[PDB]
Amino acid sequence: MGKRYVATPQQSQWEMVVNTPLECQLVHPIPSFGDAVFSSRANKKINLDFELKMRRPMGETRNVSLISMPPPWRPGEHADRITNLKFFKQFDGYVGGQTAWGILSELEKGRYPTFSYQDWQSRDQRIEVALSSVLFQNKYNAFSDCISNLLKYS
Amino acid sequence: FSSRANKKINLDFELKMRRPMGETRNVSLISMPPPWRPGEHADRITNLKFFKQFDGYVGGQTAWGILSELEKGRYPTFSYQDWQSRDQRIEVALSSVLFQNKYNAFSDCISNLLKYS
Amino acid sequence: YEVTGVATIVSSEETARLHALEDALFKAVNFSGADIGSISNLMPLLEESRNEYQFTNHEVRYILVESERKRRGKVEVKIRVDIYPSATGCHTDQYKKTILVGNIEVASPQQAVMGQIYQVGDDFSRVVNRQLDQTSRSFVSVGTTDYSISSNYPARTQMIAQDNGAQYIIGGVITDLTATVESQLLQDDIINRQFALEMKVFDGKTGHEVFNKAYREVARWPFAKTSQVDTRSARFWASTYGEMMLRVSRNIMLDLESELSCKITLPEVVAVFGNTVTMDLGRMHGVKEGDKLQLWHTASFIDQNGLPRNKVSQSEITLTVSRIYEHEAELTIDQPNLASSVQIGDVMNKIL
Amino acid sequence: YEVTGVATIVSSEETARLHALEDALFKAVNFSGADIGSISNLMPLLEESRNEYQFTNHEVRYILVESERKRRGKVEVKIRVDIYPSATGCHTDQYKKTILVGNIEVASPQQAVMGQIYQVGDDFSRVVNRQLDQTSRSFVSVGTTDYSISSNYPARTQMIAQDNGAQYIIGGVITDLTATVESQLLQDDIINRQFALEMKVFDGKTGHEVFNKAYREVARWPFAKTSQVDTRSARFWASTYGEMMLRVSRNIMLDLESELSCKITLPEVVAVFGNTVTMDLGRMHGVKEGDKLQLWHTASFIDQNGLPRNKVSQSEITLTVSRIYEHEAELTIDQPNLASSVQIGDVMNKIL
Amino acid sequence: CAMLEPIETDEVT
Amino acid sequence: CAMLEPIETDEVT
Amino acid sequence: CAMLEPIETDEVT
Amino acid sequence: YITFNLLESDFTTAQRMADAVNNFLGPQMASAVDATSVRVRAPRDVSQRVAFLSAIENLE
Amino acid sequence: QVPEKRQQTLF
Amino acid sequence: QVPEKRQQTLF
Amino acid sequence: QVPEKRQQTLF
């Protein structure tokens, strides 16, 4: 039995941290691990950053697997592999472009975006970090409302 | 366990003893399961050296590994032959009881560390 | 081969000779190592009493009967046959199927009055259980149950199969135990008693009915009209009626081999401990170490009208056997990142 | 070798001759020191009454019967056989297995009315206990118990095995004690009584059913119809029925040898005193000083459906025997730093 | 060849 | 040709 | 060779 | 799945309870099958189902 | 020509 | 050819 | 060849 960092349904919460016409920010605290931050900014072009911020910084650069795992309360559903990222040493994990929008989409479908990788602080053992889709839809609506109200120039 | 503001990831584990280390001894670090976990085996973590008149020191990835083995609910056990005990083998274990909340507080403080020394 | 077939004449010499030939063929196939599933399709082409039989696309090519004798009132047939045991087939690479023998009932207790054979259903389900356990090739018997299995309640069938750990549940109804009297002035009366039976096999994974067949045979009732016969005793099962019922049980086993043997066996996930899962099948079912298995996500729903339905989601997860116990096995997931999607109740199939 | 086989004719000369041949072969194998586990697989190939027998891959190669006599109404067979006692095998390097004889019951008390043999189950379990104790090669009997062992309650089986210190528990049901009457005008009536039995062996470590077999034999009932027979007396066990039941017990022992003997014996940890642990097996079970043993961490769980399961975690701990008592032994852990992970209930296996 | 005729365990009798 | 005459399962008897 | 025929302890009688 | 039986049967109460579960967890999670019963998909593990039902039974 | 037993089937 | 008794098995 | 009586044993 390995390490799996996910917020239980009673622990999951999503918050709109920054709601201004220059930036929108949506934060999901992963208990005992850190935060997952979606940041969009005023620009001429579509942009979204996903940053997995860790309490204990990344020990080594590792290949990370991003999968759309079904939650436990969804039997009979298979997991969709999304992509492979690279998390860098002492830097917050970064996903950008269409993959961050894909993470938001997989959360909108009641699924868990799961990052799996080998943790340096954990004797190089495989660990999972999942984002919970509980209480997500209302904050996703607020985040999209904020995105619609962003200045269209930088 | 001590972490300090620095540009690099650093953690020091010091086994501080009331009666100082009598002689330099090879020490074995194991991840022993607690009694209330039948059917689980012990994992050999590593081999250290505890030096004379110095506190035991573990650093690098092994200190983080000790914290990880405590997070899984296990007991990090240092086994060595004690000079004060007629050169007989003794064990020193770190309990995982009441560790989770303080590990969360420790991780939060490590998060709020200055990135320069 | 050199085989003997023994069968008692009831009303026709042809039927007794055919039964003896079937017995000899069954013994020859069992000794030869050939599959017993294919025998049940050979019998229809054996209705004719020809001295020579020609067959194509079978493990037996030509049948030649050399000796036919009616010693001690029962036909003895000696034949020589050529059996080709195929090393391949859809039945040799599959794990054994666990089967639970359900309740077999007498529909009309009125028919069981003669001899007071009221527990004939239970003592016959015991025989079917032992026949499936110690005579079949692709079946393991997990015992008998006292509950009745019906097609109207797939949920109950699934629950009972889960409780007993059975992939299939087999139950029947005995529909005819009546007898007629044949009278001759020279000799005493002859009582020929009937034994009709309708067997039904249900799939424990989804509650569906996968097998349905009817059997009817007749045999002499050697006992007195007013005599009470115990169905657990050797007096009942060594009589002509007992031999007929044993032959009926053998035919049940051969039909189960003919129908269910080449269905792909689907062991179930019993427990998941991180990256290692447990399988309900073990060493006694044919599991060997190093086997590669493919996981299927199971989702079987009762539709809007209350009828059972099946739906499996294909998975990218492959497992290999790490440790083997007599009744269970441990599997390691080859894709650790997908290990979180494995739940209890998912099925697996061996990769060929 | 020079052996004699004695067996009484019941209904067929072939059966009596076969039983006498089995007795002679058993005595020859016991004297030769060969394993008695392999005998139980030789009998099926002895159905034929050939004067010469040829076998391959066995400790006996050719069997030649030289004398057959029917003195005093029972067949006496004298044979010469060549037995090759193999020094190797999967059964010679294992410690003895402690077995508890469970409750054997009569399913139908109605069948035991003739002779009032109602305690036949208990007095037969006593015979099975003594047969396993003083005739087997790889078994030690820890006594009998009055509790009934079932497959529905693995926890009770584990608790009873722990209480009695038994690795396996053996219990059965006597299913047929009925008799028939054969009448001749020249002589008196002949009463042939049945003895059917279903034996079941459960593993005390996990509650699983590891063995299941059925026995049925027939023998003459020499006593009067209205006479009461005591099942503890020599009048019962010296009669033809008693000889048949003794032969059935011997067949039970030989089947247990055939099935369970080459299972790896797993002594359990009784107590841990720092770096020294205690083993439930001792000098009387074959433990010798200097033996090296490998520790396994035991974790057997009842799954979500109530069915027993097994799971052992492999360990890096090796133990050597330091002091040996008649019934226990002391082991020293070769890895002192890992000694803290040894708990009571962990099993060990001898390193070969 | 020549198939054997050894009997087996009775199913009920 | 020559049709066979093998019997089948009885419908009720 | 020549196997002996010495009897042993009775199991029940 | 697990099923909730309303103490006071009503079509609107059944549908509102279905929406409450779907908003909390996600789409296509709960469905009202009549005026009394609401079916919620649940984990197969008994321990996870108790943990799952603990979060669901406290919904407002 | 004998009928052939059922072939391999999944579910 | 006689069937061979069960071979060595663990658990 | 006669079997030999039990040898010396401690405990």
Distinctive features:
part of a larger assembly; 11 chains; A: 154 residues; mainly beta; five-stranded mixed β-sheet; H: 60 residues; alpha+beta; 42% helix
What does it look like?
This is part of a larger assembly, with two copies of chain A, two copies of chain C (352 residues), three copies of chain E (13 residues), one copy of chain H (60 residues) and three copies of chain I (11 residues). Chain A is mainly β and 154 residues long. Chain A is 15% helix and 42% strand. Chain A has a five-stranded mixed β-sheet with strand order 1-10-9-6-7. In chain A, strands 2-3-4-5-8 form a five-stranded antiparallel β-sheet, with helices on one face. In chain A, a hairpin with a 2-residue loop joins strand 2 (15-20) and strand 3 (23-30). Chain A is globular. Chain A starts with a strand and ends in a 6-residue tail after the last helix. Chain C has 352 residues and is of the alpha+beta class. Helix content of chain C is 20%, strand content 34%. In chain C, a hairpin with a 4-residue loop joins strand 3 (60-69) and strand 4 (74-83). In chain C, helix 2 crosses helix 5. The longest helix of chain C has 21 residues, at 240-260. Chain C starts with a strand and ends with a strand. In chain H, a hairpin with a 4-residue loop joins strand 2 and strand 3. Chain H is built from two helices and three strands. Chain I is low in regular secondary structure and 11 residues long. Chain I is rod-shaped. Chain C binds chain D through residues 130, 133, 143, 162-163, 165, 230, 232-235, 270-271, 273, 278, 280, 323, 325-328, 330, 344, and chain D through 107-108, 110-111, 151, 175-176, 178, 180, 194, 196, 208, 210, 212, 214, 216, 218, 301, 303-312. Chain B: It is found in: Membrane. Chain B: This is Component of sodium-driven polar flagellar motor.
Topology (SSEs and partners):
The structure is cut from a larger assembly and holds two copies of chain A, two copies of chain C (352 residues), three copies of chain E (13 residues), one copy of chain H (60 residues) and three copies of chain I (11 residues).
Chain A: E1 3-5, E2 15-20, E3 23-30, E4 34-41, E5 49-54, E6 62-69, E7 80-87, E8 93-96, H1 98-108, E9 112-119, E10 125-130, H2 137-148
Parallel strand pairs in A: 1-10
Antiparallel strand pairs in A: 2-3, 3-4, 4-5, 5-8, 6-7, 6-9, 9-10
Chain H: E1 2-5, H1 11-24, E2 30-32, E3 37-40, H2 46-56
Antiparallel strand pairs in H: 1-3, 2-3
Chain I: no helix or strand
PDB class: motor protein
Keywords: Polar flagellum, Polar flagellar motor, LPHT ring, Bushing, motor protein
Entry title: Cryo-EM structure of the LPHT ring
